[PDB]
Amino acid sequence: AGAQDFVPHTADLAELAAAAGECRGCGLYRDATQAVFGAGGRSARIMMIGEQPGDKEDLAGLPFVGPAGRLLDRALEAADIDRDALYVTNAVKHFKFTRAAGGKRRIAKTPSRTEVVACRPWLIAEMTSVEPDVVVLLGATAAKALLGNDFRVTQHRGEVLHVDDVPGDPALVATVHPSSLLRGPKEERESAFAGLVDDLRVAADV
Numbered sequence: 001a002g003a004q005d006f007v008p009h010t011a012d013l014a015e016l017a018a019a020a021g022e023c024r025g026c027g028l029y030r031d032a033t034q035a036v037f038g039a040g041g042r043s044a045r046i047m048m049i050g051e052q053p054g055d056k057e058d059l060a061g062l063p064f065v066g067p068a069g070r071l072l073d074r075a076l077e078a079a080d081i082d083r084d085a086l087y088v089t090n091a092v093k094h095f096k097f098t099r100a101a102g103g104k105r106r107i108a109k110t111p112s113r114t115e116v117v118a119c120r121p122w123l124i125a126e127m128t129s130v131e132p133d134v135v136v137l138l139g140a141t142a143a144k145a146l147l148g149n150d151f152r153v154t155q156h157r158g159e160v161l162h163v164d165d166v167p168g169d170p171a172l173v174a175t176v177h178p179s180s181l182l183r184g185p186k187e188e189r190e191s192a193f194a195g196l197v198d199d200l201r202v203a204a205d206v
Ligand SMILES: O=c1cc[nH]c(=O)[nH]1
Pocket: 050, 051, 052, 053, 054, 057, 062, 063, 064, 065, 066, 068, 090, 179
């Protein structure tokens, strides 16, 4: 059942966000500081979904406020997407992490399929409340939550997809995770940013 028993019968994002602070749907609530719900309004045409809040998001209470958020904003700007048209969230709402002695941060640990399924009720409540025209899936974790554990983003990036089992039959565009555009050689990171901007343009045009 996961988080399903904790999700209230309401589409109000403020009430949903408050209830998510009380969620015990998986074990991630324990070590995490707080729940990081999505940001934006129900008028949004474009929903974007990442994997999970990171270290800054965990303490800031908001999604994409770190370096990946900076690179996403750089790409949204290049695709002329207004953030007024955006509801932005993640597949899990609790930071899963570890600490490496001598590190400068708490390190994100990849969510399990069990944690992603436990938390999908919140993502369904968000899609039901926002009724997006298009869902942008940022990375493998977010894309598998809605397209299956077998889905490969590398093979389907920038394709307009539609699955019948998804609420509202919104179009789905899967793309690379913005954190991937931080690591690597200059011209690959640049090629990768250009691919992200194309994927955002496809979604803005849906
Ligand atoms: O997937 C991610 C990574 C960083 N911050 C988020 O909000 N989501």
